[PDB]
């Protein structure tokens, strides 16, 4: 049935054994139906899961799904099925899907469910075909039933960003929902670009004479205050 084409492969963080024995920090806490959490800890799993797929601002009272919650709290589904039926929910489709140019929705799916950046451009190509023909359904079926997702999340775990921050460093990687927000640099281009946004330029004003020039001492001021 035309399988996915053979693509390349890159080297990111998620494929090494970082020896964070007795791990100190940057491990998501873990949100799992395995620990038999009561009402609250259930609500914390539910909110975290919502943020992970919908992520932050998109999660809202209107989008919020009561019914999949009431099923999840009562044990009628697994968390994995909750994440799936989350993405199939249409409020996620009106925002994050109808906007995204097909190759870009592949980012937010391989990246909001698996917690890893895309290996190369070719990955975006192949997976965008299978979501272009089979529909969104079987694409999400591919990611979830994949060997990878079973290997690290199993049946009941909210997906996280794997290895975003190294043990001995602070920077690491930018947070995920930050990295692919939703709107695509070029999505607007086809429509009217945004307008009447000047006021913000109007409010912050600097005379040209005030602006620092090359070779003044003031330009390096910031460096001095960090030492």
């Amino acid at each position: 049935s035309i399988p996915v084409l053979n693509y390349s492969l890159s080297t990111q963080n998620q494929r090494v054994y970082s020896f964070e024995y007795l791990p100190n920090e940057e491990q998501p806490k873990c949100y799992t139906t395995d620990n038999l959490p009561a009402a609250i800890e259930m609500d914390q799993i539910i909110w975290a899961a919502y943020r992970q797929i919908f992520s932050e601002h998109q999660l809202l009272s209107s989008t919020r799904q009561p019914f999949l919650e009431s099923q999840l709290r009562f044990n009628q589904i697994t968390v994995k099925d909750f994440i799936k039926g989350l993405i199939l929910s249409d409020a996620f489709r009106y925002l994050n899907y109808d906007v995204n140019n097909n190759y870009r929705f592949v980012e937010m799916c391989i990246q909001r469910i698996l917690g890893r950046e895309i290996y190369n451009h070719r990955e975006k190509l192949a997976f965008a075909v299978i979501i272009g023909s089979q529909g969104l359904e079987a694409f999400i079926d591919l990611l979830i039933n994949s060997e990878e997702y079973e290997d690290n999340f199993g049946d009941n775990m909210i997906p996280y960003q794997r290895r975003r921050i190294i043990a001995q460093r602070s920077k690491g990687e930018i947070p995920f929902n930050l990295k692919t927000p939703r709107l695509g640099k070029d999505f607007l281009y086809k429509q009217g670009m945004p307008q009447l946004l000047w006021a913000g330029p109007v409010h912050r004003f600097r005379p040209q004479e005030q602006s620092p020039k090359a070779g003044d001492p003031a330009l390096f001021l910031s460096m001095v205050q960090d030492l």
Partner: protein, 162 residues
């Protein structure tokens, strides 16, 4: 329920870890604030009644229409007054629980979750209770650190309803 203690044990449990020195320092710090917390908790319980009646009265004085509307939701009956004092009583109860526990866990568990759907389905404005809590925040009569322990939570509920 979210305490400081269950929070620290939950985190160290999720890291697959014993309680190290860090979490023990956290539990220490819970114990060395708990005395002011209980002084605050006893005076609120000690005069809870007058706080409730004065609160509902302040809500009535600020919003005169509530005692005048024909509709059932508004305290124009002999029922909405009792139910008005009922709800204000609930909030003052939860604040006393959170002063005993040491986090906002009891209010977040028993009270905060799902409250939008109640105030949306029963046409209950968020401000009414805001006004109530402002009177309680002004008239609890605590002093010093106990007053900070009370005003933290009483502000917190206002942050929930706003």
């Amino acid at each position: 329920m979210k305490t400081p203690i269950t929070e620290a044990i939950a985190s160290a449990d999720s890291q697959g870890r014993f309680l190290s020195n860090a979490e023990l320092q956290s539990i220490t710090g819970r114990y060395q604030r708990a005395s002011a917390s209980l002084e605050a908790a006893k005076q609120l319980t000690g005069n809870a009644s007058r706080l409730i009646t004065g609160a509902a009265q302040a809500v009535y004085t600020k919003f005169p229409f509530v005692t005048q509307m024909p509709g059932p939701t508004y305290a124009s009956n002999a029922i909405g007054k009792a139910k008005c004092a009922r709800d204000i009583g609930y909030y003052l109860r939860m604040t006393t629980y959170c002063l005993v526990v040491g986090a906002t866990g009891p209010m977040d568990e028993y009270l905060v979750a799902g409250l939008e759907e109640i105030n949306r389905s029963f046409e209950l404005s968020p401000s009414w209770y805001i006004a109530a809590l402002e009177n309680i925040k002004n008239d609890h009569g605590l002093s010093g650190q106990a007053a900070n322990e009370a005003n933290t939570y009483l502000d917190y509920a206002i942050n929930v309803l706003s």
